[PDB]
Amino acid sequence: RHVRIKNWGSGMTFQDTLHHKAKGILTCRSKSCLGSIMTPKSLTRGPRDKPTPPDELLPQAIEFVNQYYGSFKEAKIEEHLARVEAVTKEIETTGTYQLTGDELIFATKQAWRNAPRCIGRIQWSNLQVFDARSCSTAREMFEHICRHVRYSTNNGNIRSAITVFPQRSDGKHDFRVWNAQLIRYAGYQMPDGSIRGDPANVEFTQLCIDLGWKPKYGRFDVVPLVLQANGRDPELFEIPPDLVLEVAMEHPKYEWFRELELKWYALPAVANMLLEVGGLEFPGCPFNGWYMGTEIGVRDFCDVQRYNILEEVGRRMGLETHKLASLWKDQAVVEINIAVLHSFQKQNVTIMDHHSAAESFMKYMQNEYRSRGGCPADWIWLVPPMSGSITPVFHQEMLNYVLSPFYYYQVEAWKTHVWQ
């Protein structure tokens, strides 16, 4: 069956067939689309207390292996059959199975390619994979991560990479990072009720405090790494500041911008997510790419629930911060975003403006429909927080669906973990 989608901007039409290979697990339906939910249950992959049943793990396992060998140009009929055998044997004799080196690499890149919310998916083939399935202690996790950061930071020329930790076994020996991101600022609730720092990270910082970390009560304080190994209680590890590359915010024209004294980390890295590969689950798999202007400019800086500086710069620019129809809010956001890009460019740090990002995506999307006649896409997340209609993606009709491999959200560790 073919489903027709059109890009009203260019008039270009696509025929999606890949939606069939998609598993029918969604929070929405044919009576109320749960489209607009931050974190639907369908995109979540909760914890378990019993290993994945061998009988149901097998179909998925085979399914994957086929997909893997299906990727190669010239079929390896020999190795293919050989692998399928080895796997089946392993599953019924051990209850689970291990992935080959190259299989993992393929899986990570594929899961990224299958992430409907990532706009930078044109880079899916360029990914550095760190095999840390051999890891066994919290400290080792820390060391692996530092290697990851050192690599990805690359002295400013950000590189995409992912560190894969031991797969989930029984669901009690989970290896996972509790931090939403490897690098993230602290958020403290001050005595007068006000909030200093990143408001969104208040609950998490509070946790760090409870675990022994002493608050520095500053606007840009990098939280410690909360590492959980083998399901054991987590341990804190401060990231060596030398590895934390930041960018000071300053506007090209407005010198008063420096006075706001803003900055931000260069490395966007999601740690709290789970990787699903042919039935297997990996609760610990941090991955990173590079920032997109708007993420910092619009979201991090302008969101009321975040640093919320819109009011301030509006006054600084001497705009009618009281007459909404003056569109002062808009000029402000634009200027703030220019500052962000400029600051990264001036400091030789990789950054990408939402316009270039969107155009790159359209290209990637077109390629997807040639390669596999499909491309899962969450319109709501792909259209930039500013100037939506000015980006081609805004006009592109798109289908959202879950494939495999895939990156699922997990339930915040502290909410389920049982303390020792």
Ligand X SMILES: C[C@H](O)[C@H](O)[C@H]1CNc2nc(N)[nH]c(=O)c2N1
Q: Is 219 a catalytic residue?
A: no
Nearest to a second copy of 172, 395 (CB atom): 395
Q: How far is the CB of 207 from a second copy (least distance, A)?
A: 19
The tokens describing 330, both together, are: 């808009």
User: Cα–chain-centroid distance for residue 411?
Assistant: 15
Nearest to ligand X of 44, 416 (CB atom): 44
Q: Is 118 a catalytic residue?
A: yes
| Burial class, 255, CB count within 10 angstroms (exposed 0-12 / middle 13-18 / buried 19+) | exposed
User: Cα–chain-centroid distance for residue 152?
Assistant: 15
Q: Residue 187: what residue type? A: G
Q: Are 146 and 237 in contact (CB under 8 A)?
A: no
Q: Is 121 a catalytic residue?
A: yes
Q: Taking CB within 5 to 8 Å according to partner kind, which of a second copy, ligand HEM, ligand X, none is near residue 24?
A: a second copy
Q: Taking CB within 5 to 8 Å according to partner kind, which of ligand HEM, a second copy, ligand X, none is near residue 33?
A: a second copy
Residue 412: CB partners within 8 Å, gap ≥ 6? 178, 272
Q: Is residue 367 within the footprint of a second copy (CB under 8 A)? A: no
Burial 317-354 (b: 16+ CB within 10 A, else e): bebebeeeeeebeeebbebbbbbbbbbbeeeebbbbbb
Residue 273: CB partners within 8 Å, gap ≥ 6? 285, 287, 407, 408, 409, 410
Q: Is residue 38 within the footprint of ligand X (CB under 6 A)? A: yes
Q: Is 48 a catalytic residue?
A: no
User: Residue 11 CB: number of other CB atoms within 10 A?
Assistant: 8
Q: Taking CB within 5 to 8 Å according to partner kind, which of a second copy, ligand X, ligand HEM, none is near residue 120?
A: ligand HEM
The dihedrals phi and psi of 128, each to the nearest 5 degrees, come to -90, 125
Q: Around 365, how many Cα atoms within 13 Å sit in the side-chain half-sphere? A: 30
**101-113 and 54-71 helices cross at what angle (nearest 10)?**
90
33 annotated among ligand-binding-site residues: yes
Q: Taking CB within 5 to 8 Å according to partner kind, which of ligand X, a second copy, ligand HEM, none is near residue 231?
A: none
**Interface with a second copy (CB under 8 A), residue from 17, 21, 28, 60:** 28
- The CA distance from 236 to 227, in Å, is 6
Q: What's the first-to-final CA gap in the chain, in angstroms?
A: 53
The tokens describing 137, both together, are: 């202690």
Q: Is residue 352 within the footprint of ligand HEM (CB under 6 A)? A: yes
Site for a second copy in 305-344 (CB under 8 A): 305, 310, 324-327, 329-331, 333-334, 337-338, 341
Stretch that binds ligand HEM, among 195-203, 288-296, 322-330, 389-397 (CB under 6 A): 288-296
Q: Is residue 103 within the footprint of a second copy (CB under 8 A)? A: no
Place of tokens 């895939």: 406
Catalytic residue among 290, 302, 316, 375: 290
Q: How far is the CB of 396 from ligand X (least distance, A)?
A: 6
Q: Taking CB within 5 to 8 Å according to partner kind, which of ligand HEM, a second copy, ligand X, none is near residue 47?
A: none
Site for ligand X in 376-405 (CB under 6 A): 380-381, 394-397
Residue 209: CB partners within 8 Å, gap ≥ 6? 215
**Interface with a second copy (CB under 8 A), residue from 303, 311, 312, 412:** 303
Among 33, 6, 42, 29, smallest CA distance to 116 is for: 42
How many chain residues interact with ligand HEM (CB under 6 A)?
Answer: 20
The tokens describing 168, both together, are: 């989930």
Site residues for ligand HEM per CB under 6 A: 112, 115, 117-120, 123, 127, 160, 162, 270, 287-290, 292, 295, 352, 357, 407
Instruction: Summarize as ranges the residues that interact with a second copy (CB under 8 A).
Output: 3, 5-6, 8-11, 19, 22-38, 293-294, 298-299, 302-305, 310, 324-327, 329-331, 333-334, 337-338, 341, 345, 353, 355-356, 359, 377, 379-380, 383-390, 394-401
Bind-site residues: 28, 33, 36, 118, 181, 290-291, 295, 299, 380-381, 394, 409
Catalytic positions, written as ranges: 118, 121, 290, 295
